[PDB]
Each structure stands twice: as C-alpha cells, then as structure tokens.
Amino acid sequence: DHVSVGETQIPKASTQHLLRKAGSLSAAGDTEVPIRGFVHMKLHKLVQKSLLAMQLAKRKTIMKSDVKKAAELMHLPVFAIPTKDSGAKGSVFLSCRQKGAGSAGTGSETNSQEVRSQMKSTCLIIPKERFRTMAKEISKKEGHDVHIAEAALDMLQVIVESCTVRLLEKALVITYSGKRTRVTSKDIETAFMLEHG
Amino acid sequence: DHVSVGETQIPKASTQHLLRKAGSLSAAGDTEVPIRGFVHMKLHKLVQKSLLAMQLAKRKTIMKSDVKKAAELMHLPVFAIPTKDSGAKGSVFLSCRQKGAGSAGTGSETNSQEVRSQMKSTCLIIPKERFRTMAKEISKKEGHDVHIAEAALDMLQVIVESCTVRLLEKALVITYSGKRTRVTSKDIETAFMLEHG
Amino acid sequence: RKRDKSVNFRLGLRNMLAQIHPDISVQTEALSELSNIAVFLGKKISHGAVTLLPEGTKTIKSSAVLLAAGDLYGKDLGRHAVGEMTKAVTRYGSAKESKEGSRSSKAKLQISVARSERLLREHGGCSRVSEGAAVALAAAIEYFMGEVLELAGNAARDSKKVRISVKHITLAIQNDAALFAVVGKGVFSGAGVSLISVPIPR
Amino acid sequence: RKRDKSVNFRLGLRNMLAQIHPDISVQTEALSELSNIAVFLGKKISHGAVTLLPEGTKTIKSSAVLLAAGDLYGKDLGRHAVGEMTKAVTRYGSAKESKEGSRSSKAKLQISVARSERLLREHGGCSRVSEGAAVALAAAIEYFMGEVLELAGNAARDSKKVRISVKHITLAIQNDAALFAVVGKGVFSGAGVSLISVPIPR
DNA sequence: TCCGGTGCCGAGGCCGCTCAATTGGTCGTAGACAGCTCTAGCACCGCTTAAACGCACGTACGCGCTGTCCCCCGCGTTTTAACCGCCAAGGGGATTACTCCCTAGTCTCCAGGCACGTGTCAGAT
DNA sequence: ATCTGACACGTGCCTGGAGACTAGGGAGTAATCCCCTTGGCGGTTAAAACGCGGGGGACAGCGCGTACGTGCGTTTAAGCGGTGCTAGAGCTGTCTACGACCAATTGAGCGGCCTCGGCACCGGA
C-alpha cells in the first residue's frame, strides 16, 4: 500500500499509456491508482530536493540547473535539452492504432501495434500543463509557492517518466516471474518494495 | 543463466546454510549452483577492484583498507573488526537442531528452530580457509598471485556473505510474490536480474 | 606501538551514553560498529550538502547541512531533527559568546564537535566551509546516534544485557524504518538482513 | 548573448564522426545526448581513479586511469580498451616529443584532449594530476564514444536516416551489454527501457 | 524446566604520553546586499481538437480445485578435512632516508570554436 | 509529387588551449626490523557426502468469476497562440564579515597493563 494520493492526478489513460510504453501487455483495473501514487511520489521527492536547493540559492524560481543537481543528488545521471526538447504532440496517434496497413491483433504480442507505435515516440507522453499544475500545486502544499521554468519542468517530465518506466519494467519482470500475463497493482508495490523498501 | 562456475566452490551445505540464514524455508535441488556462481561473482568483482587498487599502491599484499576502499567503490558502506572479528566456530551446532527442548517441526514456519538458531549466530558461516583458497585461486587466474591478509580476507567474508544474503532476501520476496513456498534457482537469477540486469 | 590515525569515537560514543542509559554499557566491537556508522552518516550528509547543493564554489553553509539532513533523514524524523539542529545552533551561539567556548565543548554532547570539521573539510568537496555547518553536522550525527543508541540500550535491557551487543543495534535499525532507510543500506556484521514481513503467498 | 560555460563537445563529437561514418550526420539533440553521456563517463571514471584508488594524497597516475577504465569497462571491452589506452599513450609520447604537439592536438581524435584536464582536475578529488592520466581519459572516453557512435550510425543506416536520431543511440546501448552496463544505468530521453527478453512464464 | 553454585577471560580501571583540540590573532577574501535590464514566466483569452471519460460487449485472464507425480527435507551413516593450535621461517610492511620529476603558475600566441544570417533539401503526407 | 523547417554553409569575433620556464614539493626508490603471513604436524569432530521415507509441493485440465480490451460518443480541457506585467535573472558595484593560517596551550584520548565479575555451564529441586 502506502500510496500517497493527492487531489490532482494525471488521467488514467496516460497511466496505461505509460504502462504499454514500458511494454505492459495488460493491466488490472486497479493498476492505475498506485502508479499515479508513485509517480506523484517520485515527483514529490524531486521537487522537494530541487526546491530546497533553490531556497538555499536565495532564488525565487526553479531553472534547469536546479533540478539537475537535485536529480543527481537523487543519484540519477540526468540531462535534457535547453533549446528545443521533445514535447507532447509529436506522437503516434491513438486512432491510427487500427492498421488497415499491417493489421494488428495477431499474437506474439497480440496487440503488436499500440506498444510499438507508442514506444517509437520521442515525445513526452504526459500533457505538459497538467504536470505543470501538479508542480505548482505541490509547491503550494509544501513548496512556498514559487515560479517554475518550463525547461526545468520538462526535464523533470523526462526524469520522472523514464524513472517510472524503469519501475514498470521491473514490475513486468516480476509478473513474468509470477508466470502470468496481466500486471496487477500489487505487482507495482512489490516492485517499489524491491526498489527501496 | 550467465552463471560463472569456477573450479573451486564452497560446499553446497554452506549454501543452503546461507539460504536458511536468509530465511529460505526450502530450496529446489538446483538452487545451489547459481548461488555459488553469484557469490563467486561478487567475490570476483570485489577482489578485482581491491587488487587493482593495491596494484596502484605499488603494493604486494591486500590489507583491510584495500578492500575497504574497493567495497565503498562498489558503493557499499563497509567496516569490520581489526582486533578480534567473529569467526566460524562460534556457531549453533548442526546436531542440536533437534530440540528435546522445545521440539521443532510444528508449523509457522515448520522448522522453527534451524533458521532461528542459525540467524542468531554472529559468526561467519563459510569456512575461512576454503574462502582463502578461492581468494588465492582467483588471484592466480587473474590476480597476479599476491599475498592476502586474513583480516582483509575476513572482512571480505562478511561483505560477500551479507550481500548474498540481501540477494536471497530479495529472492524470497520474489518467491512469495510468486505465491509459492520453496525457492528455485530461476528465482535467484531473477533477483540478480533486478539487482543489476 | 604507533598512535592512532582514524577518526576519534570511543570516549564521545561512551560519553553521553550514561545519560542515555546509565546501567547499560557497550561492547567494544559494538562501539566500533556505532563509530563507523556515525562516520558513514557524516560522509553521506557531508557529500550531499557540499558536493551537491551549492552552485559554483560557494561556501558550505550551516543551512546547507540543515537541508541535507532534512532530506536525508525521514519526513518526521528530519523535521524533528532540523529543529534540534537549530537548537544546537543556538547552543553553539551561547558557546561562542562564552569565553569558555569549545575548550570543554560547551555541552556539545558528542565528540562530534571535533569530528565534524574533519568529515566536512577533508571530504574535500570544496575547501570553503562555515563552522556553523560543522555544528550542524555535530547535531545531526549526534541526534541520529542518540536515537539509535537509546533504542539499542532498550533492546539490551530487553535482552537483560549489561553491555550492548551488535545484534541489539541490528534489531534497532531493522525495527525503525526511519533509521534503516538512512543507514540500513550499508553492510555490517552477520547476515545484515532486512527481515521482510508478512510471509504470506501474494 | 553570453558565451557558453559548459564542457565543449560539438565539434569534437562531429569531429572524427565522418571517418566513423561519412554519409551519416547527427541530430543536434542527439549530439547533446552523446555529449552528456561522454561527460558522465568522464565523471564516473575520474571519480573512480582519483577519489578511490590512490592511498593518501598521491598523484593521479595514467596507470590509475588505466585500471579505472579496465574495471569500469567490461571484461573483453576493458581489455581491448586498455591496450588502446597504451596505444594512445605512445601516440601522445610522439606528440610531446614533437614540437607541434597538442597545438593541432596531434591526432588526439576527439576534443577529449581538451575536456580531459577539466573532468579530472575540477572533479576535485585531489589537486595532484599527471597529464598522462589526462591522455588516458581522452583515449578511454574516445574509444567508448567511437564504439557507441559507430553502432548508432549503423542503426541509422538500418533506419536509412541521414542524421542520427536519439532512438538509434538508445537501441545501440540496449543492444550491447558491455556499453549498457557502463552507461545504461543513467537516464535519458523517452522511456529509457532495458527491454527485458524472453517474455515466457518462468 | 527453573534456580543457584562454578569458573574464566573479558571488561573496567589506572597510568602515562602527546598531540588533538582549542584559543587568539591577523588577511584577505569570499560573499552578501544594492542596484539596473529586460526575458520570460505567468495570467488571461480564446480558439481547436485531441484526449478523457463514460458507456457496451464479450471473452480473456486471474487462479484455485482435483488430481498426479514428484521432489527435497527430516532422519539417519559414512567420510575427510576444517579448525585449531603450535612451530618454523621469511616476505614484506612500515618506517626512515635520499633524489629528482612532475605538475601548477604565469605569460603569450594562436586558432578553432562561438554566434548570427540565407538559402536548400530531409522528412513526413 | 509538395511543403515546413531543420541545417548546411558563409561571415565575424575571441577566449580555450598550448607551449616555455620556473618552484618546489611531491614522489619514487632503497635499507632495516620484526610482525605477521604462509606452510606443516597433529588431533577431534564435525561437517561434507549421501540415501530413504514421506508428505507436502508444484501444476495440467478445467471451469469460476469477472471486468478489462476494444470500440464509439460526448465534454473538458490541452495546446497553443496572443497580449501584457513584472517579477525577477543576471551582472556589477561597494562594504565587511568571516573563516583560513600560525603559533602556543591543555588535557582528553588512547595504548598498555592489571583487576574480576558478567556471563556460560551444569547439578539439585
């Protein structure tokens, strides 16, 4: 359990999008609340580190270097684009999941199209300003309510999304060790338990 | 798979001793070759680091500080006794597993005695000089054949044993997530896969 | 024959120990145990505060260490600890205005008042270090050691042992999630397990 | 407006790129990708060789970096790399005896000849650094970048893309276990998966 | 099975050495605060539309049950060296002592890297 | 077959980098003493090595139980522009506060040795 649940959480469709991005073939209907919780959790840790950093800096706004040093304090090797980073739109479309061309729904993996199409996407998958709303809201609830730079915000996007993808990958490993196809929430908490515990 | 298997490996009874020390209730008959392999693997990594360290030191023998800095290069927080460390004999006996006093074999866990008795042992479980033979043999096969200090050797004992116990603990977590009692080798490789992969 | 080289721990650890638990004593091996745990905590927090936080070559600040402890320590434990940190700041302010000062270390309960300058400055993340930061470290390590040591002494009394044993420290750390998450990552005597709970099929 | 501050990568990365693959070009974003991967590798190996290995305040030695790379790099890859390291040692010996020397960087294929002194000395593990160690770093990072970049360019040709894309780097790293184990620990664009194999019930 | 008598080596206590920790002092230096410029973050509007959420259908997926077989674990016995202790020996670890090689510090020269602007084809439809 | 825009290429500017020279210490090498490793003998013993009974552990076929995957429609807002405000991001200035560095002082810590009692073993009730 131990799932921090705030009052603003990125849509569930985005969550299963992340899941299939990590290669989740199928997820239980409860898999989504916990992943929202722990993406919130990673976000919260990162923003706390960065924000206390800038507070030390006698600073009033987060910039790229801020979350940079914060993340490598989290012990993650990190870097992102200052000029023109990958955004959201940019992506393989949802309704083009059908394939008239090379029909999906065959086996090995069955879907065979959605996962490939979404993984081959450079773009960030979480809508930018919903995430920005989380950032501002958490900087409210603890953060002393300071300004955010979209560059730092988006590098935060990439950090958190890739980290949670790594989490889900470990979870899929867990599931296959459990010799079953669909991923459960319990699988995700077990993954996080191994991750730190 | 990917199990390095040398030509000198500490007895299997010691392996299952480690297993039950970590709290393994029961292990498949194949669980023991892989754990030997990966204890060898951790040993090999550690000794390589330490030995290249002393080779930098223009040194001819490993001492405590050597494996100390090597291990914290491995990113493990490490320390052990220079005066009088826990040895081997020292331990709760194997034949006193019976309990005339407080009979074992009841349930919750069933054995209820062997695991407790062995976990409550301060002493190192692997025979010292078999391990010393591994150290010398590996310093042959790669190490340029230099002298060893028993103090550094024994702190190496504690490092490797505790690390592999952590491994087995993660493996037990895996097994229970797999909803089954006995641990399999495959479980151990999955554990290591999560560990680094 | 030759005099010692490493970081001084023995007296300071047994110092303030009696006020934590007077009846209870220590094992020398457990004493070295706690010693290296302390110096590890110093290394980690010093590395965080120094190597990570200040942009550029800026001085290491007492507030820097304060934040470092706050993050490194748990949510509640960190919050309580940092308040204690400021308390120590006030105490050392009283020390420095006092002419007596640190000659008797003015209630700096652990020898940490002496080991702090070491663990910061010769950690060599930079050269530029405020003494207030050193006091902050002294307080942080001292609170951490006080809490863990008190739990250990309580365990020893539970085991009815006059002098502490290393297994008591093990049980204390695995017992408290807050302390464990800080230092349980490390390795030490015996198996060093985490003792995963609920042995039930998932 | 203001001139740059960070570690120079662009030309040196596209330098020697044509000999690796002439037809193939780079993406600017992929160029920064490879840049920070390079400087990370420099940081890690510099930290190993310097902070870890030499007892006391002893000089950082070329052999120190040599061993650092050998361990950090894979078994076979490290063995091949260290031989190449000594080759670079000989090459820079020829450089230093030459009056021309490093003014044209004498076949120091990457700008690594310039970034090396930075990544070592201002890593600040110590102050005491041999230039030979810097050449060793230059060689190590340069071989690593050459191998990964060649694999990436081959992937781009497989994708029939004139300029490299970041996904090509991703695929290259996940493809080679040796490179991945060194640098796949890090994070980067997109999901950053490891793509665990054999999706079969265990 | 619980409590008290038996016994030891280990912990506590003591002595003494000297150097760690402290103190004041200065220096200069790092930095903290004040002030100016103008970018961009933020707010708001407002439009487009893609996505999110809600709704339906069905069947795919979790997994436990018998039921099978099927395997390590308890118990045992058999076997040899692990441990331990002592002795020999010398390898080498640390320590002192002697020599010189190495880079940093400074200055100077220089060029290849930095930005900024214009036209063209790389890549997606 | 075409269009958007990323980039290849041209112009202009200067700091990153390199080389000569030096200071000087940091480093490498060498000699010596004995401490501590390495090996060998001898002994016990206890664990390694191994098998049998069994009883439970694992799962194939199968259905139980369902709710999630797929698919479609609507509403919300996500994206993205557009405008404006200004907060504030960065750079430079002064003023000085503070923490290095030097030197002297003090007694706390700790090595080493001696004392002994907390603690393990076991017999009696």
Side-chain angles (χ1 to χ4, degrees):
Chain A
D1 304 309
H2 55 269
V3 288
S4 172
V5 181
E7 309 302 324
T8 307
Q9 280 319 126
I10 297 144
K12 308 314 269 205
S14 65
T15 62
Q16 51 81 26
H17 281 163
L18 294 174
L19 271 160
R20 291 200 170 195
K21 163 74 75 173
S24 87
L25 183 62
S26 289
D30 288 345
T31 50
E32 307 76 0
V33 179
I35 62 196
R36 297 218 300 197
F38 307 117
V39 65
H40 185 67
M41 191 145 278
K42 279 291 178 74
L43 187 153
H44 164 266
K45 307 162 78 181
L46 274 297
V47 300
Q48 274 187 341
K49 314 293 284 296
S50 61
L51 188 151
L52 61 84
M54 61 79 71
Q55 195 151 40
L56 187 153
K58 284 179 287 196
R59 186 53 271 200
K60 291 186 282 179
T61 304
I62 297 83
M63 283 74 74
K64 172 183 77 172
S65 175
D66 292 331
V67 193
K68 165 64 153 60
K69 46 191 152 285
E72 52 93 19
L73 173 45
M74 161 75 168
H75 272 319
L76 294 180
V78 164
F79 64 103
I81 297 90
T83 304
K84 179 243 170 173
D85 187 2
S86 305
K89 322 303 299 183
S91 48
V92 180
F93 203 84
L94 274 74
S95 78
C96 75
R97 191 179 72 89
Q98 300 321 110
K99 297 309 186 76
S103 56
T106 180
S108 179
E109 75 279 14
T110 48
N111 195 289
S112 312
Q113 188 275 331
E114 198 188 316
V115 287
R116 321 326 298 191
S117 299
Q118 64 184 272
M119 65 183 73
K120 302 310 183 65
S121 293
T122 44
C123 65
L124 279 295
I125 193 56
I126 300 307
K128 63 183 180 298
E129 54 85 17
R130 278 284 188 209
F131 177 77
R132 171 178 168 93
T133 295
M134 301 215 177
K136 291 286 187 172
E137 159 201 18
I138 191 157
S139 67
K140 294 339 197 183
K141 187 176 75 70
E142 292 81 3
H144 299 88
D145 186 0
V146 304
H147 291 328
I148 301 287
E150 78 286 18
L153 186 151
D154 291 331
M155 162 284 267
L156 183 63
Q157 270 283 286
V158 69
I159 301 318
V160 60
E161 294 189 3
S162 291
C163 188
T164 189
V165 175
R166 258 158 171 170
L167 199 156
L168 297 188
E169 180 147 12
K170 300 190 178 72
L172 183 59
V173 176
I174 297 175
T175 53
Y176 287 171
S177 52
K179 310 156 52 168
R180 296 300 297 273
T181 293
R182 175 173 283 153
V183 184
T184 79
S185 44
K186 192 160 287 294
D187 295 330
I188 297 131
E189 292 83 4
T190 55
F192 185 30
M193 201 45 208
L194 277 296
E195 192 270 338
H196 297 157
Chain B
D1 304 309
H2 55 269
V3 288
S4 172
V5 181
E7 309 302 324
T8 307
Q9 280 319 127
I10 297 144
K12 308 314 270 205
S14 65
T15 62
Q16 51 81 26
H17 281 163
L18 294 174
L19 271 160
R20 291 200 170 195
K21 163 74 75 173
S24 87
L25 183 63
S26 289
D30 288 345
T31 50
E32 307 76 0
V33 179
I35 62 196
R36 297 219 300 197
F38 307 117
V39 65
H40 185 68
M41 191 145 278
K42 279 291 178 74
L43 187 153
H44 164 266
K45 307 162 78 181
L46 274 297
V47 300
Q48 274 187 161
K49 314 293 284 296
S50 61
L51 188 151
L52 61 84
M54 61 79 71
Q55 195 151 40
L56 187 153
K58 284 179 287 196
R59 186 52 270 200
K60 291 186 282 179
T61 304
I62 297 83
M63 283 74 74
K64 172 183 77 172
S65 175
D66 292 331
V67 193
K68 165 64 153 60
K69 46 191 152 285
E72 52 93 19
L73 173 45
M74 161 75 168
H75 272 319
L76 294 180
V78 164
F79 64 103
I81 297 90
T83 304
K84 179 243 170 173
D85 187 2
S86 305
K89 322 303 299 183
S91 48
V92 180
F93 203 84
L94 274 74
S95 78
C96 75
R97 191 179 72 90
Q98 300 321 290
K99 297 308 186 76
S103 56
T106 180
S108 179
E109 75 279 14
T110 48
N111 195 289
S112 312
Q113 188 275 331
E114 198 188 316
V115 287
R116 321 326 298 191
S117 299
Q118 64 184 272
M119 65 183 73
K120 302 310 183 65
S121 293
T122 44
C123 65
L124 279 295
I125 193 56
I126 300 307
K128 63 183 180 298
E129 54 85 17
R130 278 284 188 209
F131 177 77
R132 171 178 168 93
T133 295
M134 300 215 177
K136 291 287 187 172
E137 159 201 18
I138 191 157
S139 66
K140 294 339 197 183
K141 187 176 75 71
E142 292 81 3
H144 299 88
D145 186 1
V146 304
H147 291 328
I148 301 287
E150 78 286 18
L153 186 151
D154 291 331
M155 162 284 267
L156 183 63
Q157 270 283 286
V158 69
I159 301 318
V160 60
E161 294 189 3
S162 291
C163 188
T164 189
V165 175
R166 258 158 171 170
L167 199 156
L168 297 188
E169 180 147 12
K170 300 190 178 72
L172 183 59
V173 176
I174 297 175
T175 53
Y176 287 172
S177 52
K179 310 156 52 168
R180 296 300 297 273
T181 293
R182 175 173 283 153
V183 184
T184 79
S185 44
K186 192 160 287 294
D187 295 330
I188 297 131
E189 292 83 4
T190 55
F192 185 30
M193 201 45 208
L194 277 296
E195 192 270 338
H196 297 157
Chain C
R1 303 132 180 171
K2 62 186 72 172
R3 192 166 290 180
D4 294 334
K5 275 72 67 179
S6 295
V7 191
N8 46 7
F9 51 95
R10 296 86 164 175
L11 272 296
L13 285 169
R14 283 216 54 99
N15 283 132
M16 272 325 307
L17 165 56
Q19 293 78 14
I20 297 163
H21 279 331
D23 54 335
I24 301 311
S25 184
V26 73
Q27 183 56 47
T28 65
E29 314 299 10
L31 201 152
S32 55
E33 202 47 21
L34 272 295
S35 176
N36 204 48
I37 301 302
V39 303
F40 180 76
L41 183 63
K43 263 177 171 172
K44 265 280 189 176
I45 190 192
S46 182
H47 184 97
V50 176
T51 310
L52 280 298
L53 279 298
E55 60 85 21
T57 182
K58 183 54 63 185
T59 301
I60 296 102
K61 173 60 173 61
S62 52
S63 306
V65 190
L66 177 76
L67 277 296
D71 65 78
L72 174 56
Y73 291 179
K75 283 73 158 185
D76 185 74
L77 188 153
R79 289 183 301 102
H80 184 81
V82 298
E84 282 159 335
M85 296 299 102
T86 62
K87 189 272 162 198
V89 177
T90 54
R91 188 183 69 188
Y92 184 64
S94 310
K96 63 170 69 64
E97 52 202 285
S98 181
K99 174 64 178 66
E100 182 272 337
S102 186
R103 172 69 70 166
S104 296
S105 307
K106 189 269 183 181
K108 269 77 77 184
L109 307 168
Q110 297 180 0
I111 193 52
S112 45
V113 63
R115 324 173 88 174
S116 51
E117 310 85 335
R118 319 301 316 296
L119 294 174
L120 277 296
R121 200 178 277 107
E122 62 86 20
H123 182 73
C126 178
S127 49
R128 196 52 290 170
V129 291
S130 83
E131 192 161 63
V135 171
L137 182 63
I141 190 183
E142 165 169 293
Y143 181 75
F144 205 110
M145 292 315 80
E147 179 142 341
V148 58
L149 188 153
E150 167 62 18
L151 191 48
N154 301 336
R157 295 170 173 193
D158 291 331
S159 60
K160 288 77 57 185
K161 302 309 302 166
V162 176
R163 315 159 311 295
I164 193 72
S165 179
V166 292
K167 314 252 191 203
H168 300 95
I169 297 106
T170 62
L171 294 169
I173 301 290
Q174 58 78 31
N175 179 243
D176 181 6
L179 303 175
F180 156 57
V182 189
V183 305
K185 178 217 274 183
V187 65
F188 63 88
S189 178
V193 304
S194 66
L195 191 59
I196 301 305
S197 183
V198 179
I200 297 181
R202 302 308 189 235
Chain D
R1 303 132 180 171
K2 62 186 72 172
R3 192 166 290 180
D4 294 334
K5 275 72 67 179
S6 295
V7 191
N8 46 7
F9 51 95
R10 296 86 164 175
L11 272 296
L13 285 169
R14 283 216 54 99
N15 283 132
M16 272 325 307
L17 165 56
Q19 293 78 14
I20 297 163
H21 279 331
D23 54 335
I24 301 311
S25 184
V26 73
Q27 183 56 47
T28 65
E29 314 299 10
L31 201 152
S32 55
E33 202 47 20
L34 272 295
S35 176
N36 205 48
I37 301 302
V39 303
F40 180 76
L41 183 63
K43 263 177 171 172
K44 265 280 189 176
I45 190 192
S46 182
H47 184 97
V50 176
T51 310
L52 280 298
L53 279 298
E55 60 85 21
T57 182
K58 183 54 63 185
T59 301
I60 296 102
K61 173 60 173 61
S62 52
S63 306
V65 190
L66 177 76
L67 277 296
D71 65 78
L72 174 56
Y73 291 179
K75 283 73 158 185
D76 185 74
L77 188 153
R79 289 183 301 102
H80 185 81
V82 298
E84 282 159 335
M85 296 299 102
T86 62
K87 189 272 162 198
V89 177
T90 54
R91 188 183 69 188
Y92 184 64
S94 310
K96 63 170 69 64
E97 52 202 285
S98 181
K99 174 64 178 66
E100 181 272 337
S102 186
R103 172 69 70 166
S104 296
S105 307
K106 189 269 183 181
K108 269 77 77 184
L109 307 168
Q110 297 180 0
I111 193 52
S112 45
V113 63
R115 324 173 88 174
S116 51
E117 310 85 335
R118 319 301 316 296
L119 294 174
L120 277 296
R121 200 178 277 107
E122 62 86 20
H123 182 73
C126 178
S127 49
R128 196 52 290 170
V129 291
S130 83
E131 192 161 63
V135 171
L137 182 62
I141 190 183
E142 165 169 293
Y143 181 75
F144 205 110
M145 292 315 80
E147 179 142 341
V148 58
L149 188 153
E150 167 62 18
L151 191 48
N154 301 336
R157 294 169 173 193
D158 291 331
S159 60
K160 288 77 57 185
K161 302 309 302 166
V162 176
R163 315 159 311 295
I164 193 72
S165 179
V166 292
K167 314 252 191 203
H168 300 95
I169 297 106
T170 62
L171 294 169
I173 301 290
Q174 58 79 31
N175 179 243
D176 182 6
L179 303 175
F180 156 57
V182 189
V183 305
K185 177 217 274 183
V187 65
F188 63 88
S189 178
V193 303
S194 66
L195 191 59
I196 301 305
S197 183
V198 179
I200 297 181
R202 302 308 189 235

